[PDB]
Amino acid sequence: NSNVVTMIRAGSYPKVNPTPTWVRAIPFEVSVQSGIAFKVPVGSLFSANFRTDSFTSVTVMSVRAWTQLTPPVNEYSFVRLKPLFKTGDSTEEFEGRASNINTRASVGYRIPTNLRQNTVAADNVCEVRSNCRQVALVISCCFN
Amino acid sequence: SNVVTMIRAGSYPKVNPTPTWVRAIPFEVSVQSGIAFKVPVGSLFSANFRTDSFTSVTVMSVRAWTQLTPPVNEYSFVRLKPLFKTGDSTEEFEGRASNINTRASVGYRIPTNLRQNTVAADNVCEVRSNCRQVALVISCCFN
Amino acid sequence: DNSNVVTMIRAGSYPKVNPTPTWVRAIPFEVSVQSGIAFKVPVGSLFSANFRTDSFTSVTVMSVRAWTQLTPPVNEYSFVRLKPLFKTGDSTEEFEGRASNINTRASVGYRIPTNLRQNTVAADNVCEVRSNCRQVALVISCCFN
Amino acid sequence: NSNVVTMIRAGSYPKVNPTPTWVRAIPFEVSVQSGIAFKVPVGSLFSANFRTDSFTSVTVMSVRAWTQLTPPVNEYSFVRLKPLFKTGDSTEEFEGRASNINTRASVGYRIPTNLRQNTVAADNVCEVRSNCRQVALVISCCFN
Amino acid sequence: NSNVVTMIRAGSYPKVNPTPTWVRAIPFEVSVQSGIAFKVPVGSLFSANFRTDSFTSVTVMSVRAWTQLTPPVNEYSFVRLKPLFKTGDSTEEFEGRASNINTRASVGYRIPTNLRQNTVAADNVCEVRSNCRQVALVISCCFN
Amino acid sequence: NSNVVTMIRAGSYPKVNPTPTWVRAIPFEVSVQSGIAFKVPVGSLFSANFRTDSFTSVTVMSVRAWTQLTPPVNEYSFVRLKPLFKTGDSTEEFEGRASNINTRASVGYRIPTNLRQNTVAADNVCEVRSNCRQVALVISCCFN
Amino acid sequence: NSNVVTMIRAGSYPKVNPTPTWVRAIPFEVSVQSGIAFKVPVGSLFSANFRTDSFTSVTVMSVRAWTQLTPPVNEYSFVRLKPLFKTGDSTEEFEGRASNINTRASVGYRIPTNLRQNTVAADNVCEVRSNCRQVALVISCCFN
Amino acid sequence: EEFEGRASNINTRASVGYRIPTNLRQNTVAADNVCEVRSNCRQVALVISCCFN
RNA sequence: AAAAAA
RNA sequence: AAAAAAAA
RNA sequence: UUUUUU
RNA sequence: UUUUUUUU
RNA sequence: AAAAAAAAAAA
RNA sequence: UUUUUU
RNA sequence: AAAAAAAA
RNA sequence: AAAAAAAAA
RNA sequence: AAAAAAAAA
RNA sequence: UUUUUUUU
RNA sequence: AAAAAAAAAAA
RNA sequence: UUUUUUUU
RNA sequence: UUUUU
RNA sequence: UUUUUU
Ligand SMILES: [Cl-]
Ligand SMILES: [Cl-]
Ligand SMILES: [Cl-]
Ligand SMILES: [Cl-]
Ligand SMILES: [Cl-]
Ligand SMILES: [Mg+2]
Ligand SMILES: [Mg+2]
Ligand SMILES: [Mg+2]
C-alpha cells in the first residue's frame, strides 16, 4: 500500500546460493524416421534456449510427447515411448493414437520416485517411434 | 412511467468531455516465416476502433491467434515476447494447435507494476508464427 | 504479494469481437440562447472529436440536464426551461427551474421514459431551451451506438 | 384539525412546470359503416371537450371499443379492432360479439411498452369494423 | 415482457367523464408597487399556458410566494401574504424575509379544509406586499 | 383419460381474433460479396415458405448469422453484423470468426426493448459482411 | 433491460423449422336451414383469413357453437352438434338452448386424445342443427 | 482527459481534481511536468498530494 | 417472464 | 382414484 | 396443461 | 351413486 | 407497563 | 413542555 | 492504540 | 497439504 | 468463471 | 498507510 | 422484520 | 490462515 | 447499465 | 405500481 521506499531492518548475513536448481517443463522437438526408434538425449534439456546451459545434470520426473507433423496418407498418427534408464532399460511402449487424422497423437509416462536420479547429456531419456516425421516433447524435470 | 419526468437537478457537476475507455481491440498483423514482427502500439489508435482521439494507452493483456492456415504438414503455432520501454522481456509465451485446421493461441497479462502508458511509436510485443497472419485482441485502457 | 512479472494466459478459441462498440456517456456542451426565444438543441452537437464521438452517427438520449452558463439580466434571477422534442411527436411540457440567488445558476432536467428511447441522428433535435441567460450549459446522458 | 390559515415555511424556489403531463381515458364515438373499416384519427383525442386542446402529442396505451347503436335486424352486435402503428400497421382483428342482441359488443387491445411512442393528430390509432352504425371508444393514454 | 399487442376482454361500457378535475401547482408572477398591496386574482389560474382554460372554478389549498426581482439598495428582500376569503377576509400577514440580499424571500400559507371552497375568476386569493417589484407565486389548487 | 366425446358447457360467445400475432424463429440465407456489405431486407421474413405471407409488419428481437459456404483458401470464416434502424443506423460491427477452417463462423445481436418497433418489407434489418459467398440467418421476431 | 444493442455469442447452427405447427382458435360462421343438418367441412379452417392457407392438415381438439342470428318468432334459439369421424361417425346430439329469446344458444364438445388424428379439407368435423339460419363456430385445433 | 469543474455561484471558486493510479505513480524530477491547466481565471491554486523521496 | 391454446 | 351417464 | 420463442 | 376397468 | 381524544400562538 | 378553546 | 503528515 | 524467493509483524 | 476496473444513473 | 514511540 | 403521512386522473 | 515466479 | 472478466 | 400537488 506504500508508494515509497522503506527500510528493511536486515540482520545477519543469510545462507545464500547463487546457483539454485529450478523445476521446469522443457518443450523441444525430435525428428523421427519411419520404423526406426530414436533415442532422446538428455543433452537437449541443457541449452541457452531454455536458460539451462548453466546446468550439467537433471532429474527427469515425467515425459510427454506429441506428434509434431501430419501423418502419412490414410493413416492416423501414433507415438510410442520406451523409458530408458542407466540402471536398466524398460520394454514398455506407452503408445497413443489420434482418433482424427488431422489431430495430434499424444502419450506420456511418469517416472517413479525410486527411479528419479540425475542424468547427464550423454545419457538417453526414452525411445520415440512414430509414423509422423517429427514429435514434440515436454519433459518435467528438476535441474540441479 | 411512459412519459417524461422532471429531474430536480442541483449544482453543476464535475464533467469531462474526453474520458478514458477500457477496450478489447481486435486487429491483425502480417508475420513472416522465421521472423519476429514488432506489434506497434499505434495500431490501437484508429477511427476503426473509435480511438483516434487518443494518443496514449495502458495495455493490460495481449492475446493472439493465427489468422491463416499453416504450412503443409505443420500444426499452427504462435509466440509472444513482451516488450517494455524500461526493458524488453525474453519470455516466449507459445501456443500451438493440435488440429492442423485449427488456430493456435496464446496470451500474456501485464502485471500492475508494469502497466504504464505507451504511445504510437512504442511496441507491445514480438510475434512469431509459421502462419502468414496473426489476429491479436489486446485488452487495454485508453487515456 | 501480487504478480511482479508477465504471466501466460491459456487462451482458446477466437472470441466474438467488436471493433466499434457502444458507449454510455454524459456529454457537456453549451448553447447560445436569446431572450424570450427558444432554441432547438441539435443532436449533431453530441457527435464530435471534442467528445471522442465523431465515429458515431446515431445516439439514444436518456436524460437531459441544463444549467445557465452566464449571469442573468440586471435585477433578475436566472431561469431555464426545457421542452422535450420527439420525432414521433414533440412535447408541450415546460420543465422550469429557477435560481434563488441572483449570483447562482438555475438548473433543471428531465428523464426520457424507456418507451421513448429510440435513436436520434444529427439532423434531429433534443429539446427547446428558454432562459434569460444568454448561454446555457447542457449535460446529456446518452448511449452512443 | 386546523380551522384557520397556517404559515408554511417555504424555502428555495422549486422546480416548476406550467404545462405538465396528464394520464387520461378519453370517451368518444366514431362512425362506422357496413363492411367498411374506419381509421380512428389520433387528432380526435385533442379537444376542448376533453381539456386536451393544449396538447399536440399523445402516447396511446390501450384501446377499448363498444358498439353504440342497435345492430341490423336478426343480428347480434359485433366490433373489430386492427392496431395501426407508424412503424408498421398490424393485421390483428381483435373482435368481440354480443351474446344478446340488445347488449353492446365490446373488445380492446393493449399496446406493449416497446410500441408506446407518441402520435400526432395526422396519425391513426386503429381500424374499427362493426355491423352497428356507430361505435363508442375509450382510449387510455398519456398526453404530453 | 410483451413485445406485441394483446387482446383485452372488455365488458360493459364503464362510467366515464371527458372533463375531469385536476390537482396542480400553477407558477405565475405578479407586479407589486412599494407600500401597496396587490390583490392576486383567481383568474390568473385559468389560462391555456397552464392547460386550465377549460375550467371556470378552482379550490385553492395553499399559496407560496417568492420575490422575483432584486430588492432596493441596502435592503433584504421580503414578502407578505394576507389570505382573502369571500366569506370574510383575514388580517394575517405571513411574512418571510431573506438573509442574503442576493437571495429571494419566501413564505406561504395553508388553507384549512373548512375554508376550501371553489373560487371564480372575479375573486381574489390574497394580498401581496414586497419591496421587490415582482413576486413569483406557486399556488397548489384543485381545478374543477 | 376419456375415450369418448364429452359435452362442453360453453357460455357466452367469447372474444376471438382470426389473425393473431406469432413469435417465430425464421431461417433464411442471403448472398454476400467480398468486401461488400449486404443490407438484409425485412421482406425476406414475410413469405408462404414461413407461413407469414399474411403479415405486413414484424417486430425484430434478435438476429443470429452463420456462414453458409466454405471460406477462401487459407482463411477462417468470419461474419460481421451492423444493426440498422429507421430511427438511426448503428456503427457496431459485431464480428464472429471460426477457429476451424472447416467450421462455420457465427455471431448475433439482441435488440433492446426500447428499439423493438415494427418494420415493413421496405425496411432493412442489418448489414452483413463475410469472406464466404453466402450467410445463413436466423431472426427471432414477433409477427403482428 | 439495457438501452442499446448487445452482442450475442451464438454457437453452432441450430435445428430449424420454417413451417412449424400452430395451435389456434379459429372463429367462423356456417349457414343452416331449418330442420336440416349441415356438415361442417374441415377445409373451412384453411384460409388466408386465418393465416392457415399453408396448412393441408389439422388436428381438432374441441368444437363450440353459438347461434349467430335471431330465432323464429315465439321460439328460443337452440343448436345441436353431432361429431363426425373418419373411422366412424357418432350419434350424439350435444344440444344447448337459450333461456332468453334475445340471447344466443351455445354448446360444444371435446374430442378425446385417442380420436385426435389429422383431417383434410374434404373431411367433415360435425353436423350442425339449429332454428337460427346461421351459427358461429370457434374450433380449438392444431395446425400441422 | 480534461477533468473540468465549474462553479454554480459566480463569486465562488471552481474546483476539480484527479487521482493517479498505482501503475502510474513513479518519480518525477523538476524538469518534468504534472498536468496542463486551463481556466478563465488568470490564476489557479493547486494542492498536490505527493510523496517526496 | 413473452406469443398462440379449458 | 382414472373413464362414462347422473348429481347440489 | 400444450405449441412456437427462449 | 346405475355401466366399465385397475399388477393377487 | 413504551403509563387517555386535537387545534391555534411561542420550542 | 408553556398556554387559549370545543 | 497515543503522537505527526497524509487520507473518502 | 512439494522444491527455488521468506520461516518473526 | 459467480466479484472487480473504466464511463453512466 | 510515509516518520516516531510503547514494561521482553 | 408483515420493511414512513394522502388526495386527484388512468389498473 | 496471508500471497507471489516455474512445476503432472 | 454500455465496455472489460 | 404509472403520474400531478400541499
Ligand atoms: Cl476436422
Ligand atoms: Cl480437412
Ligand atoms: Cl453570494
Ligand atoms: Cl424539431
Ligand atoms: Cl412477444
Ligand atoms: Mg500428428
Ligand atoms: Mg350494439
Ligand atoms: Mg339466436
Side-chain angles (χ1 to χ4, degrees), chain D residues 87-95 97 99 106 114 117, chain F residues 12-13 15-17 19 21 57 86 113 116-118 144:
Chain D
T87 55
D89 288 339
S90 297
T91 43
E92 291 85 42
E93 286 292 338
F94 302 115
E95 176 175 341
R97 310 183 186 177
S99 299
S106 71
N114 47 290
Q117 292 77 49
Chain F
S12 302
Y13 186 88
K15 312 300 186 190
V16 301
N17 175 6
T19 53
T21 65
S57 314
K86 287 184 286 183
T113 301
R116 288 186 177 185
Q117 294 67 44
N118 273 330
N144 70 101

PDB file of all heavy atoms in Angstrom, chain D residues 87-95 97 99 106 114 117, chain F residues 12-13 15-17 19 21 57 86 113 116-118 144:
ATOM      1  N   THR D  87     -44.791   2.672 -37.473  1.00  0.00           N
ATOM      2  CA  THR D  87     -43.683   1.804 -37.834  1.00  0.00           C
ATOM      3  C   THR D  87     -44.128   0.567 -38.603  1.00  0.00           C
ATOM      4  O   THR D  87     -43.274  -0.192 -39.074  1.00  0.00           O
ATOM      5  CB  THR D  87     -42.924   1.387 -36.573  1.00  0.00           C
ATOM      6  OG1 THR D  87     -43.825   0.791 -35.631  1.00  0.00           O
ATOM      7  CG2 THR D  87     -42.274   2.590 -35.916  1.00  0.00           C
ATOM      8  N   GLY D  88     -45.430   0.357 -38.758  1.00  0.00           N
ATOM      9  CA  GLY D  88     -45.921  -0.799 -39.479  1.00  0.00           C
ATOM     10  C   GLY D  88     -47.265  -1.278 -38.974  1.00  0.00           C
ATOM     11  O   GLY D  88     -47.354  -1.817 -37.864  1.00  0.00           O
ATOM     12  N   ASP D  89     -48.315  -1.093 -39.776  1.00  0.00           N
ATOM     13  CA  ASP D  89     -49.652  -1.488 -39.355  1.00  0.00           C
ATOM     14  C   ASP D  89     -49.697  -2.980 -39.036  1.00  0.00           C
ATOM     15  O   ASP D  89     -48.988  -3.793 -39.636  1.00  0.00           O
ATOM     16  CB  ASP D  89     -50.683  -1.156 -40.439  1.00  0.00           C
ATOM     17  CG  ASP D  89     -50.954   0.334 -40.558  1.00  0.00           C
ATOM     18  OD1 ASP D  89     -50.682   1.075 -39.586  1.00  0.00           O
ATOM     19  OD2 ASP D  89     -51.446   0.764 -41.626  1.00  0.00           O
ATOM     20  N   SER D  90     -50.543  -3.336 -38.076  1.00  0.00           N
ATOM     21  CA  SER D  90     -50.757  -4.722 -37.692  1.00  0.00           C
ATOM     22  C   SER D  90     -51.995  -5.282 -38.383  1.00  0.00           C
ATOM     23  O   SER D  90     -52.875  -4.545 -38.833  1.00  0.00           O
ATOM     24  CB  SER D  90     -50.910  -4.847 -36.172  1.00  0.00           C
ATOM     25  OG  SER D  90     -49.721  -4.449 -35.499  1.00  0.00           O
ATOM     26  N   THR D  91     -52.059  -6.609 -38.450  1.00  0.00           N
ATOM     27  CA  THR D  91     -53.137  -7.294 -39.147  1.00  0.00           C
ATOM     28  C   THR D  91     -54.067  -8.057 -38.210  1.00  0.00           C
ATOM     29  O   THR D  91     -54.899  -8.842 -38.687  1.00  0.00           O
ATOM     30  CB  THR D  91     -52.556  -8.246 -40.193  1.00  0.00           C
ATOM     31  OG1 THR D  91     -51.443  -8.954 -39.631  1.00  0.00           O
ATOM     32  CG2 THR D  91     -52.098  -7.489 -41.409  1.00  0.00           C
ATOM     33  N   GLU D  92     -53.961  -7.846 -36.899  1.00  0.00           N
ATOM     34  CA  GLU D  92     -54.886  -8.490 -35.979  1.00  0.00           C
ATOM     35  C   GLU D  92     -56.285  -7.901 -36.137  1.00  0.00           C
ATOM     36  O   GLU D  92     -56.459  -6.750 -36.552  1.00  0.00           O
ATOM     37  CB  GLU D  92     -54.420  -8.333 -34.534  1.00  0.00           C
ATOM     38  CG  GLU D  92     -53.168  -9.107 -34.206  1.00  0.00           C
ATOM     39  CD  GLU D  92     -51.922  -8.341 -34.561  1.00  0.00           C
ATOM     40  OE1 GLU D  92     -51.875  -7.119 -34.302  1.00  0.00           O
ATOM     41  OE2 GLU D  92     -50.993  -8.960 -35.109  1.00  0.00           O
ATOM     42  N   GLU D  93     -57.291  -8.708 -35.794  1.00  0.00           N
ATOM     43  CA  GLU D  93     -58.689  -8.294 -35.840  1.00  0.00           C
ATOM     44  C   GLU D  93     -59.364  -8.675 -34.524  1.00  0.00           C
ATOM     45  O   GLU D  93     -60.292  -9.481 -34.479  1.00  0.00           O
ATOM     46  CB  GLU D  93     -59.398  -8.913 -37.042  1.00  0.00           C
ATOM     47  CG  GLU D  93     -59.015  -8.280 -38.375  1.00  0.00           C
ATOM     48  CD  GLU D  93     -59.513  -6.847 -38.512  1.00  0.00           C
ATOM     49  OE1 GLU D  93     -60.472  -6.472 -37.806  1.00  0.00           O
ATOM     50  OE2 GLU D  93     -58.948  -6.088 -39.327  1.00  0.00           O
ATOM     51  N   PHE D  94     -58.879  -8.077 -33.435  1.00  0.00           N
ATOM     52  CA  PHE D  94     -59.458  -8.298 -32.116  1.00  0.00           C
ATOM     53  C   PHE D  94     -60.952  -8.009 -32.149  1.00  0.00           C
ATOM     54  O   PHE D  94     -61.368  -6.850 -32.181  1.00  0.00           O
ATOM     55  CB  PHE D  94     -58.766  -7.423 -31.069  1.00  0.00           C
ATOM     56  CG  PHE D  94     -57.285  -7.652 -30.979  1.00  0.00           C
ATOM     57  CD1 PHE D  94     -56.393  -6.643 -31.321  1.00  0.00           C
ATOM     58  CD2 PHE D  94     -56.787  -8.876 -30.549  1.00  0.00           C
ATOM     59  CE1 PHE D  94     -55.032  -6.847 -31.244  1.00  0.00           C
ATOM     60  CE2 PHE D  94     -55.431  -9.091 -30.466  1.00  0.00           C
ATOM     61  CZ  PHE D  94     -54.545  -8.071 -30.818  1.00  0.00           C
ATOM     62  N   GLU D  95     -61.765  -9.056 -32.146  1.00  0.00           N
ATOM     63  CA  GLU D  95     -63.201  -8.938 -32.322  1.00  0.00           C
ATOM     64  C   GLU D  95     -63.920  -9.294 -31.028  1.00  0.00           C
ATOM     65  O   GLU D  95     -63.411 -10.051 -30.196  1.00  0.00           O
ATOM     66  CB  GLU D  95     -63.681  -9.849 -33.461  1.00  0.00           C
ATOM     67  CG  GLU D  95     -65.176  -9.876 -33.671  1.00  0.00           C
ATOM     68  CD  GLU D  95     -65.574 -10.707 -34.885  1.00  0.00           C
ATOM     69  OE1 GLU D  95     -64.696 -10.957 -35.742  1.00  0.00           O
ATOM     70  OE2 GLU D  95     -66.758 -11.110 -34.984  1.00  0.00           O
ATOM     71  N   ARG D  97     -68.235  -9.944 -29.779  1.00  0.00           N
ATOM     72  CA  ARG D  97     -69.620 -10.036 -30.209  1.00  0.00           C
ATOM     73  C   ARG D  97     -70.517 -10.084 -28.986  1.00  0.00           C
ATOM     74  O   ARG D  97     -70.133 -10.604 -27.933  1.00  0.00           O
ATOM     75  CB  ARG D  97     -69.863 -11.272 -31.068  1.00  0.00           C
ATOM     76  CG  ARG D  97     -68.876 -11.429 -32.199  1.00  0.00           C
ATOM     77  CD  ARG D  97     -69.211 -12.641 -33.053  1.00  0.00           C
ATOM     78  NE  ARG D  97     -68.199 -12.899 -34.071  1.00  0.00           N
ATOM     79  CZ  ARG D  97     -68.219 -13.925 -34.912  1.00  0.00           C
ATOM     80  NH1 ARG D  97     -69.195 -14.817 -34.896  1.00  0.00           N
ATOM     81  NH2 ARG D  97     -67.236 -14.059 -35.794  1.00  0.00           N
ATOM     82  N   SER D  99     -73.643 -11.511 -26.920  1.00  0.00           N
ATOM     83  CA  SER D  99     -74.454 -12.712 -26.789  1.00  0.00           C
ATOM     84  C   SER D  99     -75.935 -12.398 -26.634  1.00  0.00           C
ATOM     85  O   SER D  99     -76.755 -13.323 -26.612  1.00  0.00           O
ATOM     86  CB  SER D  99     -73.961 -13.537 -25.603  1.00  0.00           C
ATOM     87  OG  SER D  99     -72.603 -13.924 -25.805  1.00  0.00           O
ATOM     88  N   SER D 106     -68.211  -5.618 -27.228  1.00  0.00           N
ATOM     89  CA  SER D 106     -67.033  -4.937 -26.713  1.00  0.00           C
ATOM     90  C   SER D 106     -65.774  -5.732 -27.028  1.00  0.00           C
ATOM     91  O   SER D 106     -65.808  -6.958 -27.164  1.00  0.00           O
ATOM     92  CB  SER D 106     -67.124  -4.729 -25.190  1.00  0.00           C
ATOM     93  OG  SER D 106     -66.980  -5.968 -24.505  1.00  0.00           O
ATOM     94  N   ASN D 114     -42.845  -1.502 -25.794  1.00  0.00           N
ATOM     95  CA  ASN D 114     -41.913  -1.232 -26.876  1.00  0.00           C
ATOM     96  C   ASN D 114     -42.556  -0.510 -28.050  1.00  0.00           C
ATOM     97  O   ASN D 114     -41.826  -0.067 -28.943  1.00  0.00           O
ATOM     98  CB  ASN D 114     -41.301  -2.544 -27.359  1.00  0.00           C
ATOM     99  CG  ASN D 114     -42.348  -3.642 -27.567  1.00  0.00           C
ATOM    100  OD1 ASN D 114     -42.917  -4.154 -26.608  1.00  0.00           O
ATOM    101  ND2 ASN D 114     -42.589  -4.011 -28.819  1.00  0.00           N
ATOM    102  N   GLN D 117     -44.886   4.856 -28.401  1.00  0.00           N
ATOM    103  CA  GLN D 117     -44.325   6.136 -28.803  1.00  0.00           C
ATOM    104  C   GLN D 117     -45.450   7.145 -29.009  1.00  0.00           C
ATOM    105  O   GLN D 117     -46.635   6.800 -29.039  1.00  0.00           O
ATOM    106  CB  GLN D 117     -43.489   6.000 -30.079  1.00  0.00           C
ATOM    107  CG  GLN D 117     -42.222   5.199 -29.910  1.00  0.00           C
ATOM    108  CD  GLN D 117     -42.488   3.719 -29.865  1.00  0.00           C
ATOM    109  OE1 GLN D 117     -43.204   3.171 -30.710  1.00  0.00           O
ATOM    110  NE2 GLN D 117     -41.918   3.055 -28.868  1.00  0.00           N
TER     111      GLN D 117
ATOM    112  N   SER F  12     -71.317 -17.646 -22.819  1.00  0.00           N
ATOM    113  CA  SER F  12     -71.436 -16.555 -23.775  1.00  0.00           C
ATOM    114  C   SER F  12     -70.383 -16.680 -24.873  1.00  0.00           C
ATOM    115  O   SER F  12     -69.353 -17.332 -24.711  1.00  0.00           O
ATOM    116  CB  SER F  12     -71.290 -15.213 -23.066  1.00  0.00           C
ATOM    117  OG  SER F  12     -72.263 -15.075 -22.047  1.00  0.00           O
ATOM    118  N   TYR F  13     -70.661 -16.064 -26.010  1.00  0.00           N
ATOM    119  CA  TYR F  13     -69.697 -16.078 -27.095  1.00  0.00           C
ATOM    120  C   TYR F  13     -68.423 -15.372 -26.640  1.00  0.00           C
ATOM    121  O   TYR F  13     -68.500 -14.258 -26.099  1.00  0.00           O
ATOM    122  CB  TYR F  13     -70.262 -15.398 -28.337  1.00  0.00           C
ATOM    123  CG  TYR F  13     -69.342 -15.517 -29.535  1.00  0.00           C
ATOM    124  CD1 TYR F  13     -69.416 -16.603 -30.387  1.00  0.00           C
ATOM    125  CD2 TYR F  13     -68.381 -14.554 -29.795  1.00  0.00           C
ATOM    126  CE1 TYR F  13     -68.570 -16.712 -31.471  1.00  0.00           C
ATOM    127  CE2 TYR F  13     -67.535 -14.663 -30.869  1.00  0.00           C
ATOM    128  CZ  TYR F  13     -67.634 -15.739 -31.701  1.00  0.00           C
ATOM    129  OH  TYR F  13     -66.795 -15.847 -32.774  1.00  0.00           O
ATOM    130  N   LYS F  15     -64.423 -13.626 -26.737  1.00  0.00           N
ATOM    131  CA  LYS F  15     -63.620 -12.774 -27.596  1.00  0.00           C
ATOM    132  C   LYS F  15     -62.807 -13.663 -28.527  1.00  0.00           C
ATOM    133  O   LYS F  15     -62.339 -14.736 -28.132  1.00  0.00           O
ATOM    134  CB  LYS F  15     -62.701 -11.881 -26.761  1.00  0.00           C
ATOM    135  CG  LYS F  15     -63.386 -11.165 -25.607  1.00  0.00           C
ATOM    136  CD  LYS F  15     -64.504 -10.239 -26.077  1.00  0.00           C
ATOM    137  CE  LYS F  15     -65.070  -9.432 -24.914  1.00  0.00           C
ATOM    138  NZ  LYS F  15     -66.304  -8.697 -25.303  1.00  0.00           N
ATOM    139  N   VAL F  16     -62.652 -13.229 -29.777  1.00  0.00           N
ATOM    140  CA  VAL F  16     -61.931 -14.007 -30.778  1.00  0.00           C
ATOM    141  C   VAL F  16     -61.009 -13.082 -31.558  1.00  0.00           C
ATOM    142  O   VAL F  16     -61.021 -11.864 -31.387  1.00  0.00           O
ATOM    143  CB  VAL F  16     -62.871 -14.754 -31.749  1.00  0.00           C
ATOM    144  CG1 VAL F  16     -63.786 -15.697 -30.984  1.00  0.00           C
ATOM    145  CG2 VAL F  16     -63.671 -13.770 -32.569  1.00  0.00           C
ATOM    146  N   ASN F  17     -60.203 -13.685 -32.426  1.00  0.00           N
ATOM    147  CA  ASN F  17     -59.278 -12.966 -33.289  1.00  0.00           C
ATOM    148  C   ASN F  17     -58.782 -13.940 -34.348  1.00  0.00           C
ATOM    149  O   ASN F  17     -57.960 -14.816 -34.044  1.00  0.00           O
ATOM    150  CB  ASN F  17     -58.110 -12.387 -32.502  1.00  0.00           C
ATOM    151  CG  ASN F  17     -57.082 -11.738 -33.393  1.00  0.00           C
ATOM    152  OD1 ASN F  17     -57.282 -11.608 -34.598  1.00  0.00           O
ATOM    153  ND2 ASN F  17     -55.972 -11.319 -32.804  1.00  0.00           N
ATOM    154  N   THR F  19     -56.807 -13.498 -36.839  1.00  0.00           N
ATOM    155  CA  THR F  19     -55.483 -13.176 -37.372  1.00  0.00           C
ATOM    156  C   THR F  19     -54.587 -12.758 -36.214  1.00  0.00           C
ATOM    157  O   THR F  19     -54.320 -11.566 -36.012  1.00  0.00           O
ATOM    158  CB  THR F  19     -55.563 -12.079 -38.434  1.00  0.00           C
ATOM    159  OG1 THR F  19     -56.258 -10.947 -37.901  1.00  0.00           O
ATOM    160  CG2 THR F  19     -56.300 -12.571 -39.679  1.00  0.00           C
ATOM    161  N   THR F  21     -51.125 -12.644 -33.554  1.00  0.00           N
ATOM    162  CA  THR F  21     -49.687 -12.465 -33.648  1.00  0.00           C
ATOM    163  C   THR F  21     -49.003 -13.832 -33.618  1.00  0.00           C
ATOM    164  O   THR F  21     -49.645 -14.877 -33.464  1.00  0.00           O
ATOM    165  CB  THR F  21     -49.170 -11.578 -32.518  1.00  0.00           C
ATOM    166  OG1 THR F  21     -49.355 -12.230 -31.263  1.00  0.00           O
ATOM    167  CG2 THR F  21     -49.898 -10.265 -32.485  1.00  0.00           C
ATOM    168  N   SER F  57     -46.039  -6.576 -41.167  1.00  0.00           N
ATOM    169  CA  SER F  57     -45.113  -5.948 -40.236  1.00  0.00           C
ATOM    170  C   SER F  57     -44.534  -7.018 -39.320  1.00  0.00           C
ATOM    171  O   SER F  57     -45.072  -8.122 -39.206  1.00  0.00           O
ATOM    172  CB  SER F  57     -45.811  -4.857 -39.412  1.00  0.00           C
ATOM    173  OG  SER F  57     -46.609  -4.032 -40.243  1.00  0.00           O
ATOM    174  N   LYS F  86     -34.557   2.420 -38.430  1.00  0.00           N
ATOM    175  CA  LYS F  86     -35.127   3.566 -39.132  1.00  0.00           C
ATOM    176  C   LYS F  86     -34.862   4.864 -38.380  1.00  0.00           C
ATOM    177  O   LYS F  86     -34.643   5.913 -38.999  1.00  0.00           O
ATOM    178  CB  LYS F  86     -36.626   3.368 -39.338  1.00  0.00           C
ATOM    179  CG  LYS F  86     -36.979   2.339 -40.408  1.00  0.00           C
ATOM    180  CD  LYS F  86     -38.484   2.258 -40.650  1.00  0.00           C
ATOM    181  CE  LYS F  86     -39.206   1.535 -39.517  1.00  0.00           C
ATOM    182  NZ  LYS F  86     -40.663   1.387 -39.790  1.00  0.00           N
ATOM    183  N   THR F 113     -35.469  -3.584 -25.708  1.00  0.00           N
ATOM    184  CA  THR F 113     -36.910  -3.348 -25.693  1.00  0.00           C
ATOM    185  C   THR F 113     -37.255  -1.983 -26.271  1.00  0.00           C
ATOM    186  O   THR F 113     -38.225  -1.848 -27.028  1.00  0.00           O
ATOM    187  CB  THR F 113     -37.439  -3.469 -24.264  1.00  0.00           C
ATOM    188  OG1 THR F 113     -37.148  -4.774 -23.756  1.00  0.00           O
ATOM    189  CG2 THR F 113     -38.937  -3.248 -24.220  1.00  0.00           C
ATOM    190  N   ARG F 116     -37.587  -2.039 -30.131  1.00  0.00           N
ATOM    191  CA  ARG F 116     -38.350  -3.128 -30.735  1.00  0.00           C
ATOM    192  C   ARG F 116     -39.672  -2.615 -31.301  1.00  0.00           C
ATOM    193  O   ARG F 116     -40.762  -3.045 -30.903  1.00  0.00           O
ATOM    194  CB  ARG F 116     -38.584  -4.235 -29.713  1.00  0.00           C
ATOM    195  CG  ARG F 116     -37.335  -5.037 -29.383  1.00  0.00           C
ATOM    196  CD  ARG F 116     -37.634  -6.216 -28.475  1.00  0.00           C
ATOM    197  NE  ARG F 116     -36.431  -7.005 -28.238  1.00  0.00           N
ATOM    198  CZ  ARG F 116     -36.405  -8.141 -27.556  1.00  0.00           C
ATOM    199  NH1 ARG F 116     -37.504  -8.647 -27.020  1.00  0.00           N
ATOM    200  NH2 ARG F 116     -35.251  -8.793 -27.422  1.00  0.00           N
ATOM    201  N   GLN F 117     -39.559  -1.687 -32.251  1.00  0.00           N
ATOM    202  CA  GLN F 117     -40.704  -1.226 -33.016  1.00  0.00           C
ATOM    203  C   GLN F 117     -40.888  -2.137 -34.227  1.00  0.00           C
ATOM    204  O   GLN F 117     -40.110  -3.063 -34.466  1.00  0.00           O
ATOM    205  CB  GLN F 117     -40.519   0.229 -33.439  1.00  0.00           C
ATOM    206  CG  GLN F 117     -40.490   1.223 -32.288  1.00  0.00           C
ATOM    207  CD  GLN F 117     -39.267   1.064 -31.399  1.00  0.00           C
ATOM    208  OE1 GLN F 117     -38.139   0.901 -31.880  1.00  0.00           O
ATOM    209  NE2 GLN F 117     -39.488   1.094 -30.092  1.00  0.00           N
ATOM    210  N   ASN F 118     -41.921  -1.870 -35.015  1.00  0.00           N
ATOM    211  CA  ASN F 118     -42.169  -2.697 -36.182  1.00  0.00           C
ATOM    212  C   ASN F 118     -41.256  -2.295 -37.342  1.00  0.00           C
ATOM    213  O   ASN F 118     -40.602  -1.247 -37.336  1.00  0.00           O
ATOM    214  CB  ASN F 118     -43.633  -2.596 -36.612  1.00  0.00           C
ATOM    215  CG  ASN F 118     -44.529  -3.580 -35.884  1.00  0.00           C
ATOM    216  OD1 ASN F 118     -44.090  -4.663 -35.493  1.00  0.00           O
ATOM    217  ND2 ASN F 118     -45.799  -3.210 -35.707  1.00  0.00           N
ATOM    218  N   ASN F 144     -46.812  -9.578 -36.417  1.00  0.00           N
ATOM    219  CA  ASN F 144     -48.063  -8.988 -35.953  1.00  0.00           C
ATOM    220  C   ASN F 144     -48.720  -8.226 -37.090  1.00  0.00           C
ATOM    221  O   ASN F 144     -49.899  -7.885 -37.027  1.00  0.00           O
ATOM    222  CB  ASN F 144     -47.817  -8.066 -34.763  1.00  0.00           C
ATOM    223  CG  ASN F 144     -47.095  -6.806 -35.148  1.00  0.00           C
ATOM    224  OD1 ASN F 144     -47.706  -5.752 -35.283  1.00  0.00           O
ATOM    225  ND2 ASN F 144     -45.786  -6.902 -35.323  1.00  0.00           N
TER     226      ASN F 144
END
